[PDB]
C-alpha cells in the first residue's frame, strides 16, 4: 500500500481527520492526521483511511463529515477522475443527492447539500507522499 495527502484545490488544504472525529483541512503538511490510505471495496467505491488513527472518512444524514472508527455505509465514496488529474468524492450512501467531500475556503467542512459539481470545493488531488 501507499498513503496519500488529498488537497483541496478550494483553498489548498491537505484533507484531515482528527482524533476526534472532527474533518477539516489544514496547510501544514508535517501534520499527523493527512496521512490518507485509499482502498478499493469495488471499482470506483473507495474507503479514504486515516494512516495515523486508523479512523475512516464519513458523511452522515446531514451531509457532515465525520471520522469513522469502523467502516459503514457512511464510509463509501464514489471516486471519479476530473479534468485535471484531479478528483471527486460522492457519498455512495446519499448519491442520489450528489453529496460531495468538499471543503470551505477557511478549510472547514462544506456539508454535502452545499456541494455542486464545478465548485473547487470538491476537488481533490491525490499526492504520493514522500
Ligand atoms: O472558487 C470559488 O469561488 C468557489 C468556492 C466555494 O466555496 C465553492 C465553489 C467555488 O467555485
Same mark, same amino acid.
Given at each position: 500500500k501507499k498513503p496519500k495527502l488529498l488537497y483541496c484545490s478550494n483553498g489548498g488544504h491537505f484533507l484531515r481527520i482528527l482524533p476526534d472525529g472532527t474533518v477539516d483541512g489544514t @496547510? $501544514? @503538511?508535517? $501534520? #499527523?492526521?493527512?496521512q490518507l490510505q485509499l482502498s478499493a471495496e469495488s471499482v470506483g467505491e473507495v474507503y479514504i483511511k486515516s494512516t495515523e488513527t486508523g479512523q475512516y472518512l464519513a458523511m452522515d444524514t446531514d451531509g457532515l463529515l465525520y471520522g469513522s472508527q469502523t467502516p459503514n455505509e457512511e464510509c463509501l465514496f464514489l471516486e471519479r477522475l476530473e479534468e485535471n488529474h484531479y478528483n471527486t468524492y460522492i457519498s455512495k450512501k446519499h448519491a442520489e443527492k450528489n453529496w460531495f467531500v468538499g471543503l470551505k475556503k477557511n478549510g472547514s467542512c462544506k456539508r454535502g447539500p452545499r456541494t455542486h459539481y464545478g #465548485?473547487?470545493?470538491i476537488l481533490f488531488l491525490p499526492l504520493p507522499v514522500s
Open positions: @496547510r $501544514d @503538511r508535517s $501534520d #499527523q492526521h493527512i #465548485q473547487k470545493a
